[PDB]
Amino acid sequence: GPLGSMGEKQSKGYWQEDEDAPACNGCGCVFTTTVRRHHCRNCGYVLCGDCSRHRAAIPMRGITEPERVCDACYLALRSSNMAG
């Protein structure tokens, strides 16, 4: 039977392949043997160490604890107002 109006076939955090992302999505820096490839838990794009040196939590993505992200994602989430 069809899933209907609702379906859990939905995916979160799209990871861009190493080959598709030969350069940093954030700073456009090229990945080399010495530079390990990484992914941001928000945008799901490939980020080098320098572009993934920041840390932040993502309560929208279900991440209540600070996790590794890139510069843009760190900011987008950062757009939210801190309770006080």
Side-chain angles (χ1 to χ4, degrees), residues 36-45 47-49 51-58 63 65-71 73-74 77:
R36 296 186 304 197
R37 190 182 295 87
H38 302 292
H39 302 281
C40 172
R41 301 291 294 186
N42 287 307
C43 61
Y45 302 142
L47 288 295
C48 72
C51 269
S52 73
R53 289 190 301 165
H54 292 275
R55 305 182 72 171
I58 328 175
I63 302 170
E65 308 302 345
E67 299 299 343
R68 63 191 184 192
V69 296
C70 88
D71 296 348
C73 307
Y74 182 85
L77 294 166

Side-chain angles (χ1 to χ4, degrees), residues 15-57:
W15 59 87
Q16 184 177 351
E17 298 183 352
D18 300 3
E19 293 181 349
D20 294 347
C24 214
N25 289 105
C27 70
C29 79
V30 212
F31 300 100
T32 71
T33 64
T34 66
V35 170
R36 296 186 304 197
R37 190 182 295 87
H38 302 292
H39 302 281
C40 172
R41 301 291 294 186
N42 287 307
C43 61
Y45 302 142
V46 178
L47 288 295
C48 72
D50 288 350
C51 269
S52 73
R53 289 190 301 165
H54 292 275
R55 305 182 72 171

